[model samples]
Target: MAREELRRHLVGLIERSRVVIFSKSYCPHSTRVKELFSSLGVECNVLELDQVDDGARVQEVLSEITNQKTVPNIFVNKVHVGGCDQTFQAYQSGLLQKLLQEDLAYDA
Candidate 1:
């Protein structure tokens, strides 16, 4: 609820998850990111902020942190990769695949 607590939680998500996506359930861009990962056969920690009670506050903190006010606030391998366009570009350029491969290697 508090900004401090929410900030900590957001950081935890970013640090702990290989792919953390702060998205909205109904957002097309969010859907794009989700589907992109799906096509890669990868699972992500997707926090659909619109469905959460602290959605607005989370978005506020998100913007403060990532400086992006839009949905599909995506992080790959603990790095911010911007929105749909940036993420798709990462995929297109094989950056996404590289990250996932590193994750796979880390796991094993």
Candidate 2:
């Protein structure tokens, strides 16, 4: 798939959720982000690119768009929140919880 098309695809996928994660199934960082949300009793829509055909292209576009080259390219309410470390830091500093709360209110 073309870069623009892949970029658009990722945007569309992320737009599908309040919290969307682009990940690789075997990536520990990806697992960390997922687990963080899980521990919070929240569900984040995850896309395991390694299991998808255009996953590589998707990652390429992801890096270009989100400026994140690693797995667990995390988004909160469609906003880029960086990688696993970034996500965890936000959680620790109370940013993630704030975002989740906003999402809850968004759905209410």
Candidate 3:
């Protein structure tokens, strides 16, 4: 049941926008991720982990699943993309833009 709720909550956030950034309020990497999305003229759903109550648990769940520990836990179309470094890399390699342009969707 707990995992189910977590799944629901996570999916909800990811599907809430084409791009969702789970970040810390004061993290530079987090800021960089947002800036990158903004540069692409994309509206990313930004969630400041430190400002939410169950933020740690949300991060934990993703960490358990994706092994992503750092902030700027980026999700593109409900897929765990990664942090600023990975996002930047993808952007340079054109993968990020490709993923963003897709009409693909994820179920839970």
Candidate 4:
């Protein structure tokens, strides 16, 4: 896909879903993140960074939004929710549920 198209798709994914996870295939952390979301019955769209030829570009976009450079990065309602541990902590503290329940009017 073209760079612009990839970026648009990514933006759309996050805008439309309450949760979005950017992960890698071989990373155990990524697996754990997905499993946690699954266990909570939270449906999230996972973007595998390695599959994208513009991996760096994607990372740049994520970092710009979250100010973090790490796999398993997550966004909730188009807002950066940080990495696996942060996400799990949010769930444990009930913040995740609250955030998920809040309606988001994402501005493109």
Candidate 5:
């Protein structure tokens, strides 16, 4: 997709879904995160940074949101939920379920 189209899709995913994962195609950690979501039957949008020319900008946006430079950044209802390990931990501890059920009021 074009950069603008990718951005629009990303924004739409955030607007329409409760979870969105901004990730890289080459990252094994990101693959695991997606697998976890799939196992849990949770639907999410995964954006591959490498496919877009504005990948750096995407990283910048993710960093600004999470205050960290981490691949496989997950957002639950527009709320930053950290990376793969954090997400896996949350899932194991049952916090992820609660987070999914809660509404996040975030402004882009």
Candidate 6:
């Protein structure tokens, strides 16, 4: 089915980076989070949902997978990490960097 196909595509995107952000181009929250990643020197795979033909449908599929109905939907090492605020929480508590470090260690 199309949903399964979309899921596979999303999975492939997630697998390409330890940090993947499903974002909308015009969203301030999305911009903020992406900036945070840049500030931390973290490489990210960003999918600008608004730029894709299947954007909305892809968002719908994301909601089904993440149970979060919002943009700036984030993932780390294929694990859903919720939205912007949640990510900031992870950063403040040091879990975000820890996750990235683990991924780096795994790659090394």
The lowest-lDDT stretch of 10 consecutive residues in candidate 2 is 99-108
Q: Write the per-residue lDDT of candidate 3 for residues 7-61, one digit (tens) a residue.
A: 6777687876788898888998888888888888998788788998887787787
Give the CA lDDT, 0 to 100, for residue 87 in model 4. 86
Models 1 onward score TM values of: 0.89, 0.86, 0.85, 0.82, 0.78, 0.90
lDDT of 6 by residue, 1-108 (tens): 558988988877787678899998999999999999999998888999999988889988888888999889998877788999999999999988887777432231
TM-score (C-alpha) between model 2 and the true structure:
0.86
Instruction: Residues 7-59, candidate 2: write the lDDT tens digits.
Output: 77678777767788888888888887888888888877888989989778777
Q: 3 or 4, which is superior by lDDT?
A: 4
Preferred candidate (lDDT higher): 1 or 6: 6
Ranking by TM-score: 6, 1, 2, 3, 4, 5
Error of 1 at 51 (Å): 0.8
Clashing pairs in 6: none
Candidate 1, which ten residues in sequence have the lowest lDDT sum?
99-108
Winner by TM-score between candidate 6 and candidate 2: 6
lDDT of each: 0.85, 0.80, 0.81, 0.83, 0.79, 0.86
Candidate 1 per-residue lDDT over residues 48-105, each given as its tens digit: 9989997898899999989998888899888889999999999899887887676522
lDDT of prediction 4: 0.83
lDDT of 4 by residue, 1-108 (tens): 336676677778888877889999899989998998898898888889998788888888767656798989988877778998998899899988888888777543
Give me candidate 5's TM-score against the actual structure: 0.78
- What are the clash counts of all predictions, listed in order? 0, 0, 0, 0, 0, 0
Using lDDT as the measure, which candidate wins?
6
Residue 48, candidate 5: alpha-carbon lDDT: 87
lDDT of 2 at 68: 70
The runs of at least 3 residues in candidate 3 whose Cα sits more than 4 Å from the true structure, single-residue gaps closed, are: 1-3, 105-108
